[PDB]
Amino acid sequence: ALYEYQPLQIETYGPHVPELEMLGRLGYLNHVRAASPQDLAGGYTSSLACHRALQDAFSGLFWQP
Amino acid sequence: KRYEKLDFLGEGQFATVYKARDKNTNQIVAIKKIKLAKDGINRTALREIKLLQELSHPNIIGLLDAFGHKSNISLVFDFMETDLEVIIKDNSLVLTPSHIKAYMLMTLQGLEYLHQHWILHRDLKPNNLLLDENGVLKLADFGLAKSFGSPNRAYTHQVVTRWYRAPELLFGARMYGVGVDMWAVGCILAELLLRVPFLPGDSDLDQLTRIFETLGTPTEEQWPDMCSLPDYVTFKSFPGIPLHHIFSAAGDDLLDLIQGLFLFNPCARITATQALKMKYFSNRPGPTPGCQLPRPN
Amino acid sequence: MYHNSSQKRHWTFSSEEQLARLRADANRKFRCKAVANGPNDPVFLEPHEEMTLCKYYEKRLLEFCSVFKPAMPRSVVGTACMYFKRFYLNNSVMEYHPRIIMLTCAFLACKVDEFNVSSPQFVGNLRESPLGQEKALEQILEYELLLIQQLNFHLIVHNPYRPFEGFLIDLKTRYPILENPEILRKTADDFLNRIALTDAYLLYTPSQIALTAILSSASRAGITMESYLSESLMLKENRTCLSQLLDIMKSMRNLVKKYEPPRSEEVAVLKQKLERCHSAE
Numbered sequence: 286a287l288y289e290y291q292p293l294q295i296e297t298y299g300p301h302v303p304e305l306e307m308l309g310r311l312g313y314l315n316h317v318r319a320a321s322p323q324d325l326a327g328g329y330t331s332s333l334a335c336h337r338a339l340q341d342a343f344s345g346l347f348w349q350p
Numbered sequence: 351k352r353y354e355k356l357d358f359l360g361e362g363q364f365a366t367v368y369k370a371r372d373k374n375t376n377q378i379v380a381i382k383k384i385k386l387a388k389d390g391i392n393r394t395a396l397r398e399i400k401l402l403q404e405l406s407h408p409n410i411i412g413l414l415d416a417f418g419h420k421s422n423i424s425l426v427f428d429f430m431e432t433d434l435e436v437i438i439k440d441n442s443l444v445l446t447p448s449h450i451k452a453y454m455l456m457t458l459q460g461l462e463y464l465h466q467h468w469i470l471h472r473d474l475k476p477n478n479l480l481l482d483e484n485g486v487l488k489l490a491d492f493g494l495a496k497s498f499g500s501p502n503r504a505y506t507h508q509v510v511t512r513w514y515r516a517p518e519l520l521f522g523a524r525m526y527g528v529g530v531d532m533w534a535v536g537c538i539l540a541e542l543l544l545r546v547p548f549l550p551g552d553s554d555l556d557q558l559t560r561i562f563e564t565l566g567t568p569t570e571e572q573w574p575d576m577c578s579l580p581d582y583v584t585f586k587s588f589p590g591i592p593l594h595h596i597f598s599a600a601g602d603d604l605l606d607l608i609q610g611l612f613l614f615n616p617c618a619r620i621t622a623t624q625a626l627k628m629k630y631f632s633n634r635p636g637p638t639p640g641c642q643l644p645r646p647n
Numbered sequence: 648m649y650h651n652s653s654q655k656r657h658w659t660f661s662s663e664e665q666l667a668r669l670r671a672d673a674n675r676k677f678r679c680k681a682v683a684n685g686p687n688d689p690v691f692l693e694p695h696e697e698m699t700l701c702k703y704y705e706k707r708l709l710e711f712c713s714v715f716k717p718a719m720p721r722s723v724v725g726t727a728c729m730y731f732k733r734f735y736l737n738n739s740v741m742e743y744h745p746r747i748i749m750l751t752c753a754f755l756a757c758k759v760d761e762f763n764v765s766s767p768q769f770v771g772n773l774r775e776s777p778l779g780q781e782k783a784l785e786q787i788l789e790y791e792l793l794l795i796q797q798l799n800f801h802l803i804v805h806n807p808y809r810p811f812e813g814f815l816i817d818l819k820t821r822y823p824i825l826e827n828p829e830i831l832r833k834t835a836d837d838f839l840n841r842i843a844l845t846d847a848y849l850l851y852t853p854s855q856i857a858l859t860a861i862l863s864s865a866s867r868a869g870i871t872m873e874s875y876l877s878e879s880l881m882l883k884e885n886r887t888c889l890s891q892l893l894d895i896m897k898s899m900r901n902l903v904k905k906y907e908p909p910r911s912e913e914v915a916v917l918k919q920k921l922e923r924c925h926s927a928e
């Protein structure tokens with residue numbers, strides 16, 4: 286009765302959001318402001334702000350009430 | 351107003367908590383009745399209301415109902431019998447490796463969900479990890495919890511109980527992410543293992559001394575940009591104690607978990623997701639069922 | 648996150664006529680109550696007259712939030728305006744005066760969005776005598792729990808503003824056919840301000856609203872963006888989702904075209920009837 290990680294499947298009713306570590310290698314990070322050294326030192330990376338913006342953009346895009 | 355008040359469960363700065371029976375179902379609930387001038391309804395109550403209305407996960411406290419009268423609101427929760435602090439302090443309970451695995455697993459699941467919904471708990475400590483009678487741990491006390499990932503907001507740095515406060519908050523980070531909860535999970539894991547507060551600093555500078563004395567003073571190679579933090583002051587170069595000399599009973603898998611949770615660089619410090627993917631959870635022994643977790647009675 | 652929000656679950660409705668029923672029912676209950684309190688009396692407002700006053704007081708909320716010192720962030724203004732809309736969905740403008748609920752909506756929004764304004768800083772933004780500011784504060788605090796009860800304790804509001812930024816990032820990185828999508832920003836913000844006056848925020852997702860605003864700015868620019876929808880958003884594989892999405896954006900644009908502002912001489916009469924109904928409450 287061991288754990289095995291399951292990816293936490295929640296339906297976002299909209300397009301696939303590119304994963305947090307892909308954002309730079311897919312060029313999304315060119316189009317947001319960079320994290321300042323203070324922000325970086327605290328753990329804010331602008332991958333956070335980028336990913337949150339992309340997640341909101343696609344959240345319920347395909348949902349109708 | 352469908353709630354018959356049974357027992358008194360505690361008082362804190364903003365609220366008194368009571369055990370109540372929901373008359374409409376005969377469920378036992380905890381009613382947190384908010385205490386009070388010209389500011390209206392207390393923000394700590396509204397913070398808890400706004401965030402817990404948007405979250406639904408086994409390992410986060412369910413806000414079952416809310417109601418009130420003229421600026422005195424009251425929030426109804428799942429009744430939890432105990433907290434992890436009572437388990438940690440109860441010298442009659444043995445915290446086996448499977449118990450520690452189970453408590454960690456449920457915490458990180460709750461925290462994974464919470465972090466995926468872009469909320470920092472921002473007050474993680476053994477008090478705030480409540481256990482129901484079925485042995486399901488829930489995150490509770492959302493009074494400091496905040497939405498993160500927005501640069502357009504500054505956050506305060508005085509926002510985890512000192513002993514569980516990450517070094518970026520002690521060095522005065524006003525922008526941060528999941529590292530402030532993931533450090534506190536480290537501190538809780540350490541306290542599950544040791545049965546005593548891991549880094550019990552008397553002040554914020556003493557907390558930094560306790561951290562660096564225990565885990566080593568971070569280099570700018572370990573934590574780039576560290577020197578940029580508002581309240582950065584340089585410390586003496588402590589070597590740190592090797593984690594197997596601290597956690598003498600920890601396996602190498604558990605030491606990798608602990609090490610990942612305690613990285614000084616909050617970017618490099620493991621997320622709840624990547625914590626859950628670590629071989630510590632996947633290995634033997636299995637995490638205990640909630641029905642078999644130790645019950646402080 | 649919107650896709651599991653209280654907003655999606657409870658406050659995004661199937662049609663503009665479902666909203667009309669809620670409001671008609673709220674108007675009816677005030678009359679039914681007032682007559683049971685001691686029946687087709689011209690002192691009452693009709694639902695369309697309540698609608699004109701709600702449109703008027705939405706606009707005054709916008710102006711209050713516009714001039715507000717310290718500068719109120721766009722998500723607080725959007726959260727306030729959403730509360731104002733949601734309140735007067737199940738509540739009569741004859742029972743609770745919209746000038747007070749406007750301010751209670753703003754005050755609750757400031758608190759909910761962590762825009763830590765003090766009560767004296769808040770009512771200092773009312774162009775009133777200081778006795779009237781303190782009187783207005785008493786009314787703001789008096790109505791605050793009432794607002795929260797009438798919102799069903801669902802306080803988080805998802806505005807189009809962050810999804811709009813997300814699409815503007817996504818356009819730049821994945822859709823190089825639109826070179827410089829920031830040309831769309833001003834005219835997409837204009838559409839976003841227009842669609843906020845309508846019932847769209849109760850009918851569509853904030854992502855749909857944000858996308859409509861972007862694509863309407865693009866169509867206004869002579870830029871086709873069907874390839875963004877089909878190729879980039881993958882709707883080439885699910886034409887039945889492309890159809891639904893284009894229908895939503897079409898219905899949302901038509902919902903802006905059918906918007907008529909609250910007319911100044913109409914409002915000037917309706918306010919007197921509103922005041923008369925409040926005097927004789």
Ligand SMILES: CC(C)c1cnn2c(NCc3ccccc3)cc(NC[C@H]3CCNC[C@@H]3O)nc12
Pocket residue numbers: 359360361362367380381382411427428429430431432433436477478480490491
């Ligand atoms: C408000 C809600 C989250 C809640 C549900 N059960 N419960 C209990 N139950 C009794 C108890 C006794 C001892 C240790 C833990 C729980 C006590 C309690 N006390 C209030 C605070 C105290 C600090 N820890 C977090 C609590 O919510 N809050 C709650």
